Amino acid sequence: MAGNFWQSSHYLQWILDKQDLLKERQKDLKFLSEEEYWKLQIFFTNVIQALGEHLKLRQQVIATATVYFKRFYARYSLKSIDPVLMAPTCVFLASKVEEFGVVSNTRLIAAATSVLKTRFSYAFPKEFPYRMNHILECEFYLLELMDCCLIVYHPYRPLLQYVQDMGQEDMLLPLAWRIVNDTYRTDLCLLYPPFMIALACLHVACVVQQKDARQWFAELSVDMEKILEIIRVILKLYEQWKNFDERKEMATILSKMPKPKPPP
Amino acid sequence: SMDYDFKVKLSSERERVEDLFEYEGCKVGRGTYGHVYKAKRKDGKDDKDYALKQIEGTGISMSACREIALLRELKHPNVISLQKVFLSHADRKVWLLFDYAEHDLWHIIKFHRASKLPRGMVKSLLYQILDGIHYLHANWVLHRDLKPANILVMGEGPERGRVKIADMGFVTFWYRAPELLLGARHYTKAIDIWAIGCIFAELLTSEPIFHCRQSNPYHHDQLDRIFNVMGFPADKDWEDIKKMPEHSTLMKDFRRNTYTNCSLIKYMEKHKVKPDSKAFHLLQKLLTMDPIKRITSEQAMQDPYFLEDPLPTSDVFAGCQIPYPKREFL
Numbered sequence A: 001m002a003g004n005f006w007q008s009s010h011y012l013q014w015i016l017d018k019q020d021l022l023k024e025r026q027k028d029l030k031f032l033s034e035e036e037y038w039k040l041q042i043f044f045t046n047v048i049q050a051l052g053e054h055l056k057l058r059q060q061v062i063a064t065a066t067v068y069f070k071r072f073y074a075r076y077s078l079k080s081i082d083p084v085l086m087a088p089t090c091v092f093l094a095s096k097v098e099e100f101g102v103v104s105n106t107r108l109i110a111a112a113t114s115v116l117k118t119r120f121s122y123a124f125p126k127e128f129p130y131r132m133n134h135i136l137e138c139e140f141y142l143l144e145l146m147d148c149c150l151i152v153y154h155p156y157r158p159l160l161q162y163v164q165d166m167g168q169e170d171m172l173l174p175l176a177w178r179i180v181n182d183t184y185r186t187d188l189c190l191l192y193p194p195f196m197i198a199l200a201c202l203h204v205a206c207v208v209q210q211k212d213a214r215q216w217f218a219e220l221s222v223d224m225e226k227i228l229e230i231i232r233v234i235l236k237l238y239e240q241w242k243n244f245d246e247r248k249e250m251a252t253i254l255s256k257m258p259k260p261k262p263p264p
Numbered sequence B: 001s002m003d004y005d006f007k008v009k010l011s012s013e014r015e016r017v018e019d020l021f022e023y024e025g026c027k028v029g030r031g032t033y034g035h036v037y038k039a040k041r042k043d044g045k046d047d048k049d050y051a052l053k054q055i056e057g058t059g060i061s062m063s064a065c066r067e068i069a070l071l072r073e074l075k076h077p078n079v080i081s082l083q084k085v086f087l088s089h090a091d092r093k094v095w096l097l098f099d100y101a102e103h104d105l106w107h108i109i110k111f112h113r114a115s116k117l118p119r120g121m122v123k124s125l126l127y128q129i130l131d132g133i134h135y136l137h138a139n140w141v142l143h144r145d146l147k148p149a150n151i152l153v154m155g156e157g158p159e160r161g162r163v164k165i166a167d168m169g170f171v172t173f174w175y176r177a178p179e180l181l182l183g184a185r186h187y188t189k190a191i192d193i194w195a196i197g198c199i200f201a202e203l204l205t206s207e208p209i210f211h212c213r214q215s216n217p218y219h220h221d222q223l224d225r226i227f228n229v230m231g232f233p234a235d236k237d238w239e240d241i242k243k244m245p246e247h248s249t250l251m252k253d254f255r256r257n258t259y260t261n262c263s264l265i266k267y268m269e270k271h272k273v274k275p276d277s278k279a280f281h282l283l284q285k286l287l288t289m290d291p292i293k294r295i296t297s298e299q300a301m302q303d304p305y306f307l308e309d310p311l312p313t314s315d316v317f318a319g320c321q322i323p324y325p326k327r328e329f330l
């Protein structure tokens, strides 16, 4: 699907207010600091990226899975459903929505086991504990708690349209595309329309590559104060990236994270 | 795995299809999609009929996924509206809720051919099918399986005579474009247009234009029936026919000479549709063998056929009494 964003469920229900988002986060902020909570969000973004790469899924599928994961925890506590179970469930659902297909029971469980064992052993000393019955249960909860909103718009399609319109596809697109991937280390996908994220990423790419695009950006007629807000977040994410050592910090942060309560 | 209090809260608050609707023994439809029930609310807040679609199999299949994803976004008077989704946690069945459509083209056509369709109704039906598919096509959504059984028509009530395109989850190849039968790998906007052409011909004659007796894309008997109606395409008519994966099979199994006295004019004339009518000229533009030479939905809507008397109406029945019987309980 490629519908009008202004009539989409993404815009009408999943473009949230930063303050309403901070208010819902308070429930988990009793155990984790604000800093540890964003670190945990980056970690699971990287877990979803590693899961998708193993399964050889297109960036569109990984981005859809990441947005599902974030939308779920924007409304619910980290203790509701284990994020270790939610991450491969989000990949499983996104692969179906994005017409890639049903990942087999064997392929999904082996992908989650292998990825956590190979690429995330520093944070998980024990093997992936879930089986297919856990994913199928989690899937039903995920679909329900997203109000069956499956179509997700990403900054990749408008970014490609902007860069092509500039006539700078060879030079700017590889860097701007990489910045869009990095954007998933933040909450931007929950706060701003994708075209706005794409423009800010293209802006940061122009600044890094030292290309004058002032006139092209000036002829757009978009809320530049909103593009500037996104730019500030992008610049902040690289400072966060520099100071964050995922491999040395995550076992402790995961241990502080609230765990699902068992039946009495 | 999951928090106890979280599960218990959701379980207490979750609306169950069996608590909200009475549908036991109210099955009206069956197929690949699943099952369809004509239900009534258990709480007397409404007396209107509702359609409950129990999806085939357990969990979220690709079909169930496509229907939920798209219908959650799509908003058009000629595309069926999804009102609610029920996720039955006990048996893992998915239920989709819509307003009940008393009629469909499969039952309407069947009623008329059993007699052996008013021309104003035919025109209004086609205009609403094209309006609905144009909206889908503008949103880059391809139906991939249009047929009379999927073109629903609303009965008595606030939407009387309104067409609703159903089945967004996508044995008989009567509505399948010739390029699909020759191995075209992808579905296109043109494939949906061919299907609309088939439906239009059937609305004008009460007969499926490419009716054929009963897993690879190549279907010989179906192609033979297309050629018996349309004639064998000349090289000039469909230049890229040589690029089709089954072109060599087509050359091996057929000879263009067999279909020399075959044409859509000859076929339509046997069923009393005039070759100089605006209806025929539009039908011929929809049923073009070469997909790149097939008219678009927007161009079809602009056809002078819709400007000729009578104009298409929002109620396809145009305030006249519906002769079609109500759907029977299976």
Ligand SMILES: CN(C)C(=O)Cn1cc(-c2ccc(-c3cncc4ccncc34)cc2)cn1
Pocket: B028, B029, B030, B031, B036, B051, B053, B080, B098, B099, B100, B101, B102, B104, B106, B149, B152, B166, B167, B327
């Ligand atoms: C094997 N057999 C002979 C049959 O199944 C006979 N049959 C039954 C149908 C049928 C078609 C559409 C609906 C329906 C109504 N109202 C809203 C709907 C919303 C979504 N989907 C379907 C809806 C119900 C029944 C067609 N043919």
